[PDB]
């Protein structure tokens, strides 16, 4: 119907068509140096996760009270590791590790982070941040807590000289660019059956969903292998010639490139094609999130790769895709998450992913372009 908060906000209203491209408002030319108030009893501190216990304090704020399934089953389960991966990317400031302590117990209760990216929105690149991991403390909820601290990271970003954000959420907000779905391809269906994420259908057992979704023990494409420094400048280079085709993507720096798919055990993994001919012509990437399962006596987690970026010259999607599967089942992953953006509608149904529950909306702060469909995101977040 309204939205309080994002009403407020240079964001474009839904159900409105844009039929132009550019900032909502203009640049701030002088902006506001106080932070802006949070309730009596709390405090802001900007979190350095280079100190080990805070950056657990963090872990654990995420544990307890971040991104949960509509049905309150699953919870993200971000590791320490990855979370430094996410949130330390070149360019990373302090400042845009933005913390909420309460002010008696020192108790983290709140948090929001910028990341700064280049970002190729149709015709035009704009240096932006991303904005992730906006959590409130499931005791703090509901009690307007949440637009403090996209106010003040806002105010955070525009001190550094940024006007536009990227962002998903679940939810739907004034106003998204782009409407993608989950798709998940079981990897481990019996313990899948077993924490209630899927169902063993009517017309199949146990027996046959095994069956059906077995894969082979290794993959197949030709001297496919784990990415190593000596690939950064051409995965470098496969990467921002194939995102060309695509409408909203990052524009990464060789040393972004080696940050973001340069292979570390249990947060990224990367893997590449070298030819007959010693030439990579093809790399495929996954990250490592597991989720909590809640309330159940004996499975506690369960393991899930997401699909990154997958980029194709000579090998087919659909073979790179197939040895993604077969990978992720060899590292001991449960499940294999892929979003339906960039040319993944050509592979998903082929591969037995089934579509998941609810959207991932694609969201620009303070800029107005037309909405795009998912085939022409080429934008994967953390
Ligand atoms: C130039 C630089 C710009 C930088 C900033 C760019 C914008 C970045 C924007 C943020 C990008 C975040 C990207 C990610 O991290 S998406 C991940 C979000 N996190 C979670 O879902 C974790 C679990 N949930 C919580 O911690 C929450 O309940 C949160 C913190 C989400 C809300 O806390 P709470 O439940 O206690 O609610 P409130 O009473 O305080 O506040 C209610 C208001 O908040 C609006 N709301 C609710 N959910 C979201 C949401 N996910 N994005 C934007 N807005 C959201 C809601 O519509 C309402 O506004 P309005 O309806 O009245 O208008
Ligand atoms: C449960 O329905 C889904 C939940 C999630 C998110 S919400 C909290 C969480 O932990 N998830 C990761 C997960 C959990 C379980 C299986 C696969 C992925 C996603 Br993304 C897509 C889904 O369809």
């Given at each position: 119907?309204?939205?309080?908060?994002?009403?407020?906000?240079?964001?474009?209203?839904?159900?409105?068509?844009?039929?132009?491209?550019?900032?909502?408002?203009?640049?701030?030319?002088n902006?506001?140096?106080?932070?802006?108030?949070?309730?009596?009893?709390?405090t802001?501190?900007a979190?350095?996760?280079?100190?080990?216990?805070?950056?657990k304090?963090l872990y654990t704020?995420?544990?307890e009270?971040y991104?949960?399934?509509?049905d309150?089953?699953?919870?993200?389960?971000?590791?320490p590791?990855?979370?430094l991966?996410?949130?330390?990317?070149?360019?990373?400031?302090?400042?845009?590790?933005?913390?909420?302590?309460?002010v008696?117990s020192?108790?983290?209760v709140?948090?929001?982070?910028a990341?700064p990216?280049?970002?190729?929105?149709?015709?035009?690149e704009?240096?932006m941040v991303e904005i992730?991991?906006?959590?409130?403390?499931?005791?703090?909820?509901?009690?307007?807590?949440?637009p403090?601290?996209?106010?003040?990271?806002?105010?955070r970003?525009?001190?550094?000289?940024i006007?536009?954000?990227?962002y998903t959420?679940?939810?739907?907000?004034?106003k998204?660019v782009?409407?993608?779905?989950?798709w998940?391809?079981?990897?481990?269906?019996?313990?899948?059956?077993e924490?209630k994420?899927?169902?063993?259908?009517?017309?199949?057992?146990?027996?046959?969903?095994?069956?059906?979704?077995?894969?082979?023990?290794?993959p197949?494409?030709?001297?496919?292998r784990?990415?190593?420094?000596?690939?950064?400048?051409?995965?470098?280079?496969?990467?921002?010639?194939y995102?060309?085709?695509?409408?909203?993507?990052?524009?990464?720096?060789?040393?972004?490139?080696?940050?973001?798919?340069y292979p570390?055990?249990?947060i990224i993994?990367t893997?590449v094609?070298?030819?007959?001919?010693?030439?990579?012509?093809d790399f495929?990437?996954?990250?490592?999130?597991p989720?909590?399962?809640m309330?159940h006596?004996?499975?506690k987690?369960?393991?899930?790769?997401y699909?990154?970026?997958?980029?194709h010259?000579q090998?087919?999607?659909l073979?790179?895709?197939?040895d993604?599967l077969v990978?992720?089942?060899?590292?001991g992953f449960?499940?294999?998450?892929?979003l339906?953006?960039?040319?993944?509608?050509?592979?998903?149904?082929?591969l037995?992913?089934?579509?998941?529950?609810?959207?991932?909306?694609?969201?620009?702060?303070?800029?107005k372009?037309?909405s795009?469909?998912?085939?022409?995101?080429?934008?994967?977040?953390?």
């Amino acid at each position: 119907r309204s939205y309080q908060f994002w009403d407020t906000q240079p964001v474009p209203k839904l159900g409105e068509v844009v039929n132009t491209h550019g900032p909502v408002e203009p640049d701030k030319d002088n902006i506001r140096q106080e932070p802006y108030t949070l309730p009596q009893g709390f405090t802001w501190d900007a979190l350095d996760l280079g100190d080990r216990g805070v950056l657990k304090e963090l872990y654990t704020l995420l544990n307890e009270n971040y991104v949960e399934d509509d049905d309150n089953m699953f919870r993200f389960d971000y590791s320490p590791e990855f979370l430094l991966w996410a949130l330390r990317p070149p360019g990373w400031l302090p400042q845009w590790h933005c913390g909420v302590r309460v002010v008696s117990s020192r108790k983290l209760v709140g948090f929001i982070s910028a990341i700064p990216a280049n970002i190729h929105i149709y015709d035009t690149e704009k240096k932006m941040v991303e904005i992730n991991f906006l959590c409130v403390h499931k005791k703090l909820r509901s009690k307007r807590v949440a637009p403090v601290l996209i106010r003040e990271i806002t105010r955070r970003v525009h001190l550094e000289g940024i006007f536009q954000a990227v962002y998903t959420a679940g939810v739907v907000l004034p106003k998204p660019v782009g409407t993608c779905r989950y798709w998940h391809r079981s990897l481990n269906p019996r313990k899948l059956i077993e924490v209630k994420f899927s169902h063993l259908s009517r017309n199949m057992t146990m027996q046959r969903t095994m069956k059906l979704y077995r894969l082979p023990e290794t993959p197949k494409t030709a001297g496919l292998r784990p990415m190593e420094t000596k690939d950064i400048p051409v995965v470098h280079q496969l990467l921002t010639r194939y995102l060309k085709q695509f409408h909203l993507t990052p524009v990464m720096s060789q040393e972004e490139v080696e940050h973001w798919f340069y292979p570390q055990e249990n947060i990224i993994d990367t893997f590449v094609v070298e030819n007959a001919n010693g030439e990579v012509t093809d790399f495929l990437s996954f990250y490592t999130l597991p989720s909590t399962i809640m309330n159940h006596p004996t499975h506690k987690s369960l393991k899930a790769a997401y699909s990154f970026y997958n980029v194709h010259t000579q090998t087919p999607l659909l073979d790179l895709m197939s040895d993604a599967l077969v990978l992720a089942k060899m590292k001991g992953f449960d499940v294999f998450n892929a979003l339906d953006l960039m040319e993944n509608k050509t592979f998903l149904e082929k591969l037995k992913f089934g579509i998941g529950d609810g959207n991932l909306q694609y969201y620009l702060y303070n800029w107005k372009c037309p909405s795009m469909g998912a085939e022409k995101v080429g934008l994967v977040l953390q």
